[PDB]
Amino acid sequence: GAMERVLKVFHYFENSSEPTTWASIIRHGDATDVRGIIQKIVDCHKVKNVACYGLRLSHLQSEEVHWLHLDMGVSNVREKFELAHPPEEWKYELRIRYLPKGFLNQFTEDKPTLNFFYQQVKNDYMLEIADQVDQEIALKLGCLEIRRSYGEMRGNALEKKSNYEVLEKDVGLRRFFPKSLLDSVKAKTLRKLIQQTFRQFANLNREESILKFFEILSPVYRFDKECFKCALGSSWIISVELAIGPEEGISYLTDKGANPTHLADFNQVQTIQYSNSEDKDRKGMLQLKIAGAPEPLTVTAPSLTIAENMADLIDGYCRLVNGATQSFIIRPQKEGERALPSIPKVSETDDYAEIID
């Protein structure tokens, strides 16, 4: 629009508000790209690992997700998805998506990022598995968040009923523990289990609490890779599940619980070329030219949305491991080749992004 260019971006940089509420309001221009939106948010929190962050668009009433590539124009994206469904039904969310090898060690030297990643993974934990994990695991993770959140509290404070009551009655234990834990244990017993569990973590500082949380969660929940149902090959097409992450590089899965089988490291990917089959129901294809392999790795995704999301992921990792700011995706030249959509074809410039605090 003209004055409709105000974008709300939800994020995981903590403040005193409601977590479901953490967001920045950004006024942008007609030429601002995703890269500019990301940069402005993360520089405001003094992030070092800028290359880790992406922007995910989801429809509040679908499981569908759109990862917005850094070079996509904001107004282009908004106009395209506002043709599908109106503005109020979309959520734009800043997320860490491209993890360096050894990400935890690296994030320890960038506290805003370590904290953001923690809040991100905690949110997904509480939403997707906290009601199902072992109650001992849910007790410990909840106790760690208490320890981290109330950093100045003396380590034995929760032994006092009057202190525990503030968490139970005023704050709400739902902030830290799943409904199923709270609905299934008597209140007095829950109090005792919390007080006791908390003792093993009572002397941990905020960073140590965060690192302990990841240590305890990693066994029961993978938050360091994404998986895609797709198919590999150019002649014979074999259906697979790809597992993409810092430990896997690009891998494929075989048996439930077996180590993934390695295909390629991110640092061997030279180019990424996107194409669409010419079928009435067009297929999304990615060709990855891999250093040392004469044939490209060809991936056929079940939809164009999925292929675009996979391209964002793989390109993000290429940029990250090579320390590059530019994309490795190459321009379409032949029949059926495609670019990713919505790329365009002191603060009065039309790419300005400004946070409205």
Numbering used by the authors: 31 to 375, 391 to 402
Describing publication, verbatim:
Focal Adhesion Kinase (FAK) is a 125 kDa non-receptor tyrosine kinase that has multiple implications in cancer cell signaling, invasion, proliferation, and metastasis. Activation of FAK occurs not only through autophosphorylation of key residue tyrosine 397 (Y397) by FAK itself via the kinase enzyme, but also through transphosphorylation by receptor tyrosine kinases which can bind to the FAK N-terminal FERM domain directly. The proto-oncogene Src directly binds to FAK through its SH2 and SH3 domains at phosphorylated FAK Y397 and a proline-rich region in the FERM-Kinase linker, respectively. FAK also functions as an intracellular scaffolding protein through its FERM domain and C-terminal FAT domain regions where FAK forms multiple protein-protein interactions to connect oncogenic signaling pathways.
Here, we report an x-ray crystal structure of the avian FAK FERM domain at a higher resolution (1.97 Å) than previously reported, elucidating new structural features of the FERM-Kinase linker segment that impact the druggability of the Y397 region. The protein crystallized in the orthorhombic space group P 212121 with two molecules per asymmetric unit. The overall conformation of the FERM molecule displays strong structural similarity with other FERM domains of ERM family members ezrin, radixin, and moesin, consisting of three subdomains (labeled F1, F2, and F3). In this work, we solved the FERM structure at a much higher 1.97 Å resolution and we were able to rebuild the segment (363–375) in this area including the RALPSIP motif. Residues L370 and P371 of the SH3 binding motif from FERM molecule A pack into a pocket formed by residues I359, Y304, E338, M102, and H99 in between the F1 and F3 lobes of the protein. Residues 372–375 of the motif bind along the side of the F1 lobe however visibility of residues 376–390 cannot be determined. In our structure, the Src SH3 binding site makes intramolecular contacts with a pocket in between the FERM F1 and F3 lobes. We speculate that the intramolecular interactions between the Src SH3 binding site and the FERM F1/F3 lobes may be an “autoinhibited” conformation that prevents binding of Src to FAK and therefore the full activation of FAK by phosphorylation of Y576, Y577, Y861, and Y925. Upon further examination in PyMOL we noticed a significant difference in electron density of key activation residue Y397 and surrounding residues in the FERM-kinase linker as well as residues in the F1 lobe proximal to Y397. Computational prediction of this pocket in our structure suggested that the Y397 region has poor druggable characteristics, contrasting previous reports.
